[PDB]
């Protein structure tokens, strides 16, 4: 996954995308997560060496686009 924002310390808004092998969780909640950042307020929420994955993230006009 990826986590976005400006300060990321439960003060202002922070994006979160996590793939948990069944769905794609997208949250904008500011709250903290697992203390070690690894895999074992919500105004917007969206639930859906052999491999090379390419992504492009950009942010224009308040819009987050993912290619």
């Amino acid at each position: 996954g990826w986590i976005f924002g400006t300060t990321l310390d439960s003060k202002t808004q922070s994006l979160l995308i996590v793939n948990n092998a069944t769905n794609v969780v997208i949250k904008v909640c500011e709250f903290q997560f697992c203390n070690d950042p690894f895999l074992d307020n919500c105004t917007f929420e969206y639930v859906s060496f052999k491999n090379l994955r390419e992504f492009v993230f950009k942010n224009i006009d308040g819009y987050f686009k993912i290619y």
Binding site: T12, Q13, T43, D61, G62
Partner: protein
């Protein structure tokens, strides 16, 4: 409630939520109201007789 103090002009459709007491300049405040330390959150007190 409405704003009168901010340190920057917001980009279109932006959602930075911050209701702390803001400085009026370079003087630090540390969350203490006073001179050059003003709250942005004001009200208009909507009455039907205005």
């Amino acid at each position: 409630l409405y704003r009168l103090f901010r340190k920057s002009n917001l980009k279109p459709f932006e959602r930075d939520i911050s209701t702390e007491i803001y400085q009026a300049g370079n003087k630090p405040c540390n969350g203490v109201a006073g001179f050059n330390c003003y709250f942005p959150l004001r009200s208009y007190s909507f009455r039907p007789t205005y």
